[PDB]
Structure 1
Amino acid sequence: VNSFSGYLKLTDNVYIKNADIVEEAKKVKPTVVVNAANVYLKHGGGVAGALNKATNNAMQVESDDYIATNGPLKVGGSCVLSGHNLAKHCLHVVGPNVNKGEDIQLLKSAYENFNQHEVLLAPLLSAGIFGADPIHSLRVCVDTVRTNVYLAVFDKNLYDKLVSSFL
């Protein structure tokens, strides 16, 4: 049993809700919130910009120290950092940016990072400003993630479309 409320169960392990991930995180305080990161951990917009804003920029300060020490992430890769006031941990995951020419096959690799955590609150990877097809992202999620994932879809129109077209 956990504190996630109002989700539709899609499969044994995937749950979906029309919600702002920032508001879900503040309410639930999950063990792991997933950030839709870029390789530089520059949290400017979308999920990342909004999460960072909700930490009063502490996420960005921590991230800049991480990059100064370790260099950029790989597309399809991840790192675990603090969840600040939003979660115990933040799993920063880099999905491919279709607007950067990045290989959509890396979306599966990106979702594989979720399997290192028993339960996660997450956005739809590579959706929104990353330019990928969100219907495809949900399918890859369902076919890749085996741990328990609670997906927060911001746009109600998209949520309704993802549910109604789900096989």
Structure 2
Amino acid sequence: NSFSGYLKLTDNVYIKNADIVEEAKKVKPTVVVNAANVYLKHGGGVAGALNKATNNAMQVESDDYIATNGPLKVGGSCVLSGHNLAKHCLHVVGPNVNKGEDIQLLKSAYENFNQHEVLLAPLLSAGIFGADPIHSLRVCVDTVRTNVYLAVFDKNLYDKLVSSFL
């Protein structure tokens, strides 16, 4: 957990303009968060990038978890191996509001982070999940009580967030 170059937004929320895969290789944190779907099919975005960095080990492991346990629920999570990126990967399902899933479940999704003292994470429900990313950061700030280091890829988005928060 040797995080460098973050800007502290609140007592427990830190933000950096970085690729979460590169952050994970440099820091080797105890927990890396994946912005997952209910079947753990890591097709693109953050999920696809983390899976690609494990050379598909995360997808083979996720397929076995689904065959044995069934899909997650929206707002839920599971802990699996972090392979070469972290000790553990916390796979969290935020709502896809573009498909009618309730925005209130974004608070439930962020509550999963409180089960871990320190996490490296992306924003949840952003991009194709359709939530406004500045709203997602507000829910994170209001809900997460443990120490979370957020990696934001898009520099234009990072600047808007730092402008609205700090």
Same fold (TM over 0.5): yes
Q: Shift in Å at residue 49 of structure 1?
A: 0.4
Q: Shift in Å at residue 130 of structure 1?
A: 1.3
Distance across 2 between alignment mates of 1:142 and 1:166:
10
Q: Shift in Å at residue 63 of structure 1?
A: 0.2
Query: Are the counterparts in 2 of residues 83 and 89 from structure 1 also a CA contact under 8 Å?
Result: yes
Q: Which runs of 5+ in 1 are unaligned?
A: none
Q: Shift in Å at residue 89 of structure 1?
A: 0.1
Q: Shift in Å at residue 59 of structure 1?
A: 0.2
SS at match of 1:17: strand
The equivalent of 1:130 in structure 2 is: 129
**Percentage identity across aligned positions?**
100
SS at match of 1:124: coil
Q: Shift in Å at residue 115 of structure 1?
A: 0.2
Distance across 2 between alignment mates of 1:21 and 1:102:
26
For residues 62-100 of structure 1, give each alpha carbon's deviation from its aligned partner in whole angstroms, at most 9, with x where no partner exists.
Answer: 000000001000000000000000000000000001222
Distance across 2 between alignment mates of 1:52 and 1:99:
24
Q: Shift in Å at residue 166 of structure 1?
A: 1.4
For residues 124-154 of structure 1, give each alpha carbon's deviation from its aligned partner in whole angstroms, at most 9, with x where no partner exists.
Answer: 0111221110000000000000000000000
Give the length in aligned residue pairs.
Answer: 166
Q: Which runs of 5+ in 2 are unaligned?
A: none
Query: Are the counterparts in 2 of residues 22 and 54 from structure 1 also a CA contact under 8 Å?
Result: yes
Distance across 2 between alignment mates of 1:28 and 1:42:
25
Structure-2-length-normalised TM-score:
0.98
For residues 8-57 of structure 1, give each alpha carbon's deviation from its aligned partner in whole angstroms, at most 9, with x where no partner exists.
Answer: 00000000000111110011100000000000000000100000000000
| Coordinate RMSD, CA, aligned | 0.8
SS at match of 2:80: strand
Distance across 2 between alignment mates of 1:48 and 1:86:
13
Structure-1-length-normalised TM-score:
0.98
